[PDB]
């Protein structure tokens, strides 16, 4: 724990609906809406063997703000030889607000359909 | 026909309707068993129109079974689910129009409903 | 013919998401998002023909659905700021795209049906 | 090793669905549904320790999720009577199954994640 | 000074009842309900500035609260069609009336606080 | 009698059932007019049994007008409300048992409904 | 004769509050609370005969309803930890005590129905 | 602003259902649950001319804990010359948790009945 590494107050889990297994090595970039309305690169990384992303931020760097989770669905499908639909699966939301909170972004991937859900815990 | 019940099956892999999918509609009897109500395959549109009439679709518990296994297996894909089952109490508060959407992938399905008040 | 059709549905009430705002944008040469078309969803959650077969050209399109405002108007504070659908249209030639959106306060699903015209 | 796991989520609330009744059924030789297990989802909407690798055998399994009891307690009249997951388990060696169910009053989605131990 | 004030609360969520339509009427000599005020509650679930001590005259008033739409918009099926508050106002001189409402899908409570200016 | 519509009236000031309260039950007509349905006065238990029968109490929008003004003035008290109104849609999804409770105070009142599935 | 009845209701479902635990106590001379009754509500949501006219003596009584576990077991995060009704019973001759509680996650209402015995 | 005095993150509004006016100068005592499950005195203030309570705590002292709000309904009705049912009306809850929040406690009094409500804000 320091300045945005290892704590787990935000986890992204990506699944493959076609294969019925976790979506591994999916590129994704977490952004943060700056006062000048533009997106500041917050976190960068790929999904593990479990199809998850751990310790993206600390309970100190993950402050109140608008976040963009850009999941690279296209490169996942194109690597499997599939011509999909979306350029990327995007998730835009306001974080913590009431107080420090835990977030899980689940994304169910099909080439021509994506399903995104948020699950909130009470820390 | 009056289309008071509509079933639309879609393929989430192809990004097009799921064609020639076997689906059987049933109705729960007094002895808690399933009585054969309807039978039909999905058209070019991936829809099933003319399932039942306005008066034949009486109040009861309906079972819409979509044979997903046969659909995926006839493409060379061994799927997870044997089928997809939609069980719901119909009309209940008088006659209503039902729209059932099914979005399939080998290891996942999603069923939705839209109830119209005529 | 309607080359782009957008349907929005409410998973909570089981009905079309009426009067939802969708702002369509096309990726310009300088990689900026240029306003293409804006509109509200009908009583059927259908955004009937936003564009012509000629206006809707080859390019990366962004369909931004304001779900936050749909939910907030209904007394619900949703998770998402909006729903995004970013795709590449008319790459291989003219095509008929049908975007289906399914909304719940903390979950959304966007599915597509692409077809060869006529 | 936990061969069967069931997760239930609330798409409206954005939280696990708690105390939802799930009843597992194995298919018999005479095409009838024999019971297997019963359970209300944990605070995590999870249902761990349902079966054992020895108890989990070659057959067609049914998973009944009482979505109706869930929505009705919340003051909501849902569309579905329940949600049904019907699948053949361990037809080609023992495997680890995770059944995920995403619920909304008038819509539900079910996905399966299979991994070899 | 604000003569007529309406407050509406959500007993289920524990927060003000926002975007709740209310229409106020006044009984006419011909026993017909004449329009008086019409406004959808704000973030605070409160409704002020509906009248002036001058416009708010003698007669029987009706405060029709559209609780049904409020609950239906949440996907909740309520019991009541609405909530009526029928009362005689300013009979013995002008009075300051606060009309509070507490809503639950199958229950509503309405209380009144009268102040002498 | 069958008791598909019950009305219990309680005194929050006295902690006793509201005895001799006048109540008039109405039913909405096709012309949006309130047609008289039943008219009784609360018992020693503050209740009203024998208002209607399961078959007579058909689907529709019902109005239960509770004469609180008569009740509080008979005690010397100056009440706020002219009455306590209860407007609801009865049956719809088959015959249902209804129990309308009313807690009375000079300047407050609360209605609660207990719907049972027979 | 039933000298103590506890009726618990659900203002969200409009049904009796099923399987609510309530513990009754009687304040001792040292102001400590002695156990009197404990039982979870039935399908009726009512809790009759928690005592006899003999056991139920003069004193300050505490009816504690576990509203938190009721709501959390339904999947709702409520406001209050519990709901406590405290009162002096049979102080001026034995009476018939009826404690009613109406439950909403962030609100509760309690009433008293004191009747002369037999 | 100090150690639980002037900020406004907790109010107690008490109404009279008999008179139809705010229940004026009613006794009410706020407590906080200690580690040994004992009730420690926190605030003792009577309802104003508006039947409200202000000057109870700061955002500083009002910390994650269980709070007991005891309304003396018995003394209010007896002062009026009525023999009420309830010994008191008690509100027991957990405050802040996620983040520091504003809590309004509404109370409606009748000699043999009481209705209590909670209104929680965004901070």
Swiss-Prot record, chains A, H:
Subcellular location: Secreted; Cytoplasm
Tissue: Detected in serum and cerebrospinal fluid (at protein level). Highly expressed in choroid plexus epithelial cells. Detected in retina pigment epithelium and liver.
Reported impact of residue 108 to M: Loss of tetramerization
List of residues that carry 4-carboxyglutamate: 40
Result, substituting residue 85 to M: Loss of tetramerization
Sites of Phosphoserine modification: 50
Effect in UniProt of substituting residue 31 to C: In a patient with amyloidosis
GO cellular component term, pick one: protein-containing complex
Sites carrying sugar chains: 96
Keyword Calcium carried by entry: no
Effect of residue 57 to K: In AMYLD1; amyloid cardiomyopathy
Effect caused by changing residue 66 to L: In AMYLD1; amyloid cardiomyopathy
Effect of substituting residue 58 to A: In AMYLD1; amyloid polyneuropathy and cardiomyopathy
Consequence of substituting residue 53 to P: In AMYLD1; amyloid polyneuropathy
Impact when changing residue 87 to K: In AMYLD1; amyloid polyneuropathy
Variant or mutagenesis effect after changing residue 112 to H: In CTS1; amyloid deposit on carpal tunnel; patients show no other abnormalities
Other facts: Tetramer dissociation and partial unfolding leads to the formation of aggregates and amyloid fibrils. Small molecules that occupy at least one of the thyroid hormone binding sites stabilize the tetramer, and thereby stabilize the native state and protect against misfolding and the formation of amyloid fibrils.
UniProt subunit comment: Homotetramer. Dimer of dimers. In the homotetramer, subunits assemble around a central channel that can accommodate two ligand molecules. Interacts with RBP4.
Protein name per the record: Transthyretin
Designated gene of the protein: TTR
Residues of the full protein shown: 23 to 145 of 147
């Amino acid at each position: 724990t320091g300045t945005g590494e290892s704590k787990c107050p935000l986890m992204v889990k990506v699944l493959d609906a076609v294969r019925g297994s976790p979506a591994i090595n999916v590129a994704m970039h977490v952004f943060r809406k700056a006062a000048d309305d533009t997106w500041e690169p917050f976190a960068s990384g790929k999904t593990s063997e479990s199809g998850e992303l751990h310790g993206l931020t600390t309970e100190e760097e993950f402050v109140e703000g608008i976040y963009k989770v850009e999941i690279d669905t296209k490169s996942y499908w194109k690597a499997l030889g599939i011509s999909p639909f979306h350029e990327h699966a995007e998730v835009v939301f306001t974080a913590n607000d009431s107080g420090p909170r835990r977030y899980t972004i689940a994304a169910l991937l099909s080439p021509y359909s994506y399903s995104t859900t948020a699950v909130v815990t009470n820390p």
